[PDB]
């Protein structure tokens, strides 16, 4: 059970669960267009989703949930999870986003893509914030797992309450884990609570980016810019956008 894991054991589990870094199908023979750039990014996102599903199954407590509830959490959180991973990989690349090792973009490179620049700017700002805070990998994996469990929990009869309570108990364990990591790292008691709040407050901005990014992807689909894979179409359709 996830509830009996120690903090060290929780971190080890999340760290071993980490998905691989995937490469893009970037073709340097031709210039980008709006369509080709969107094709590369959505092809990448689609391949990542399969790995994300298999990562979620390894997050302590996730497989205790009903299949309906697992679907709901992933449907709610998938873009947030892709974004936090992107912002993490981009930390050491000021001014650029590392979508893949062979696809590192600055803000001018995708300027052909309508509506991109607001989102690019927010993602860059978040990566800069993580860098400034000196976010550690152990903290990152805790935050990513918090996004999975938290984002969809509020939009979940007797059975529902126990599912909710379970998610909340696991989230509490992750809070304990973050605090333990901070303490082990030498932070004072006051710095621990200040840092915990700073990290969790960033998750509000990640939600905001996800909502904007979902509307952007919807606009690209609705304009026939890029064909989305069946899975991506389903993840997008879960958000019931206009």
């Amino acid at each position: 059970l996830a509830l009996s894991l120690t903090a060290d054991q929780m971190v080890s589990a999340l760290l071993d669960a980490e998905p691989p870094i995937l490469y893009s199908e970037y073709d340097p023979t031709r210039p980008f267009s709006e369509a080709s750039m969107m094709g590369l990014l959505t092809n990448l996102a689609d391949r990542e989703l399969v790995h994300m599903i298999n990562w979620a199954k390894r997050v302590p407590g996730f497989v205790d949930l009903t299949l309906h509830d697992q679907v709901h959490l992933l449907e709610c959180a998938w873009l947030e999870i892709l974004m936090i991973g992107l912002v993490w990989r981009s930390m050491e690349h000021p001014g650029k986003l590392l979508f893949a090792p062979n696809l590192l973009l600055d803000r001018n490179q995708g300027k052909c893509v309508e509506g991109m620049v607001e989102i690019f700017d927010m993602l860059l700002a978040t990566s800069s914030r993580f860098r400034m805070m000196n976010l550690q990998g152990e903290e990152f994996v805790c935050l990513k797992s918090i996004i999975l469990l938290n984002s969809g929990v509020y939009t979940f009869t007797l059975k529902s309450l126990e599912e909710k309570d379970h998610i909340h108990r696991v989230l509490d364990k992750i809070t304990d884990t973050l605090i333990h990591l901070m303490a082990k790292a030498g932070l004072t008691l006051q710095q621990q609570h200040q840092r915990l709040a700073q990290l969790l407050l960033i998750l509000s901005h990640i939600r905001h980016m996800s909502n904007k990014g979902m509307e952007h992807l919807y606009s690209m689909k609705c304009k026939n810019v890029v064909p989305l894979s069946d899975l991506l179409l389903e993840m997008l359709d879960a958000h019931r956008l206009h």
């Binding site: 399969v50 599903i53 199954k57 299949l67 697992q70 679907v71 992933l74 449907e75 069946d230 899975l231 389903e234 993840m235």
Partner: peptide, 11 residues
């Protein structure tokens, strides 16, 4: 609707 995500969660 046989949702893809539902199936993948079982494989």
């Amino acid at each position: 609707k046989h949702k893809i995500l539902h199936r993948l969660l079982q494989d």
